[PDB]
Design a protein around this nucleic acid. Structure first.
Ligand SMILES: O=c1ccn([C@@H]2O[C@H](COP(=O)(O)OP(=O)(O)O)[C@@H](O)[C@H]2O)c(=O)[nH]1
Ligand SMILES: [Cl-]
Ligand SMILES: [Mn+2]
Ligand SMILES: [Mn+2]
Length: 553
RNA sequence: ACC
């Protein structure tokens, strides 16, 4: 039995000055009017979060768990992984990664400066030689943007981010980067959710649904997952990494990282003051995503067995889970789900919201998204991935000296291209703004899973065809759920309604077309929905030539 | 902060 955290009373402090909202939002004040509703989480609310994630865990495992873990270790044993060289690990450091306390930053790391390389040499040697001394961490509040929600308390408190010095972060990669690239896929196979594009995720869920004689589905998410992860879960994570075939030196670093960093340690705020002690997942270590996903998978698969879920097909992404299985009748389904939740709760993975069984695929939300349905160019049902557009619209209106929301618009257009809210609202706004700026042909960054991809706005039609298919330009007759949710979100943020967007889009389309070239292709393909007499849209040659593999894997 |  253990407390997730203990605290000294020292504040969780900010890094520098927190971003200020301005009196005019010139890029987004034609998108929506209720800018008062759009806020960024700050260190100010960090103490409120701290309180909500500090609690006593008392975990109890059973034979279901023991049996699943056994099978996972076995599957792990088929993996061979290597150390990264110090230098390879250095080059995987993101360009703005928070600098070391020891006199260098990401720039020096990525260029293999001598002082940075030498410091990292001594960090690595010290990991091989001291398997015990706790490694210090910094605790920080995440800054992210949401729309106020009266129901859910108004403003969400900032999540807590916990990470070690840059020098240690490089070492983590040396020991574990290769494992992060191989282990989840080896132990989960098709259940590993991170490997799928939106269309592929959709295809997978539909496939799973059609395979059952009488399907039932549900989603699950753990409340404050990192805080629920126990010291023992983390040692079990090690035992799973150690089941791979590894060179001896990696075994030793992995063990030291586990005991000195991953299982816990002292936390300092940005001012250097002792803040607390952690006995749970540090979100910010290399193993955050792999560890979350695997430990979620272990618990959830064991809980399925404990609950009597028949013929489970799982999709797991971090602490986000969908299970599609054979219905045993709604009465047993409901009982089985309570047993599932009970087992997860024993396993120290308690729910934010209790799960419930569903028998219609539209009604299952996971990873903030859900499958919906519309009609394609030949009048066939077409399934696609959508989500509540509230957060995307709020982020679309985050505009400060330090931050442009244009990249946000782009990321949503790519990921959610077939949706009614992207097609009618975000595409219309994006193209209008860039045209008026005369920056249509300037490349933008599309950010995904921490990676960044340079995209030209005028290549979107090819990109969208490749990622979502040509159907993405002719979806119509969207679902009641989706029409309702979109209209409501637009009202809530003070944006024009869909019919006004349709009028704006007509004019955006005509302006694009009038420019000829790739712009006119954007107009014809991306806004064929806006005109009375549809055009016949044919496969784009450039789309065949595209390889977008890495974007969603 | 990590993916
Ligand atoms: O910016 C983020 C968001 C989430 N997570 C990790 O993913 C887990 C699940 O996140 P979720 O969105 O379900 O929120 P939580 O379960 O933390 O309340 C977290 O506990 C973190 O370990 C993270 O590392 N960074
Ligand atoms: Cl069709
Ligand atoms: Mn969660
Ligand atoms: Mn989650």
């Amino acid at each position: 039995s253990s407390m997730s955290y203990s605290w000294t009373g020292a504040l969780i402090t900010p890094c520098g000055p927190e971003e200020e909202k301005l009196p005019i939002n010139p890029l987004s004040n034609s998108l929506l009017r209720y800018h008062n509703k759009v806020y960024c989480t700050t260190s100010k609310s960090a103490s409120q979060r701290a309180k909500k994630v500090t609690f006593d865990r008392t975990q109890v495992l059973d034979a279901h768990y023991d049996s699943v873990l056994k099978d996972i270790k076995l599957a792990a044993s088929k993996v061979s992984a290597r150390l990264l060289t110090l230098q390879q690990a250095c080059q995987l450091t993101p360009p703005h990664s928070a600098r070391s306390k020891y006199g260098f930053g990401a720039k020096e790391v990525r260029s293999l400066s001598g002082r940075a390389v030498n410091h990292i040499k001594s960090v690595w040697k010290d990991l091989l030689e001291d398997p015990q001394t706790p490694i210090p961490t910094t605790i920080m509040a995440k800054n992210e943007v949401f729309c106020v929600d009266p129901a859910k308390g108004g403003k969400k408190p900032a999540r807590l981010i916990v990470y070690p010095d840059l020098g240690v972060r490089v070492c983590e990669k040396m020991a574990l980067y290769d494992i992060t690239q191989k282990l989840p896929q080896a132990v989960m196979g098709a259940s590993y959710g991170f490997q799928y594009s939106p269309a592929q995720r959709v295809e997978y869920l539909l496939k799973a649904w059609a395979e059952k004689k009488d399907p039932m589905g549900f989603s699950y998410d753990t409340r404050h997952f990192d805080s629920t992860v126990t010291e023992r879960d983390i040692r079990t994570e090690e035992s799973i990494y150690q089941a791979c075939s590894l060179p001896e030196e990696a075994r030793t670093a992995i063990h030291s990282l586990t005991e000195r960093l991953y299982v816990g340690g002292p936390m300092f705020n940005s001012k250097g003051q002792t803040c607390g002690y952690r006995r749970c997942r540090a979100s910010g270590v290399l193993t955050t995503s792999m560890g979350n996903t695997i430990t979620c998978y272990v618990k959830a698969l064991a809980a399925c067995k404990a609950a009597g879920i028949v013929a489970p097909t799982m999709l797991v992404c971090g602490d986000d889970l969908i299970v599609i299985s054979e219905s045993q009748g709604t009465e047993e389904d409901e009982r089985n789900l309570r047993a599932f939740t009970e087992a997860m709760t024993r396993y120290s993975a308690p729910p934010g919201d209790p799960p419930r069984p569903e028998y219609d695929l539209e009604l299952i939300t996971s990873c903030s998204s859900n499958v919906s349905v519309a009609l394609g160019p030949r009048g066939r049902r077409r399934y696609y991935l959508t989500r509540d557009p509230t957060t995307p619209l709020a982020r679309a209106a985050w505009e400060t000296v330090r931050h442009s929301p244009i990249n946000s618009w782009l990321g949503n257009i790519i990921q959610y291209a077939p949706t009614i809210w992207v097609r009618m609202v975000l595409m219309t706004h994006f193209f209008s703004i860039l045209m008026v700026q005369d920056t249509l042909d300037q490349n933008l960054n599309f950010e995904m899973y921490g990676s960044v991809y340079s995209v030209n706005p005028l290549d979107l039609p090819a990109i969208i065809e490749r990622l979502h298919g040509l159907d993405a330009f002719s979806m119509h007759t969207y679902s009641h759920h989706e029409l309702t949710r979109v209209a409501s979100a637009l009202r809530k943020l003070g944006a024009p309604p869909l019919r006004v967007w349709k009028s704006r889009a007509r004019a955006v389309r005509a302006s694009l077309i009038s420019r000829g070239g790739k712009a006119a292709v954007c107009g014809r393909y991306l806004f064929n929905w806006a005109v009375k007499t549809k055009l016949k849209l044919t496969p784009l040659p450039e789309a065949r030539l595209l390889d977008l593999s890495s974007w969603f894997t």
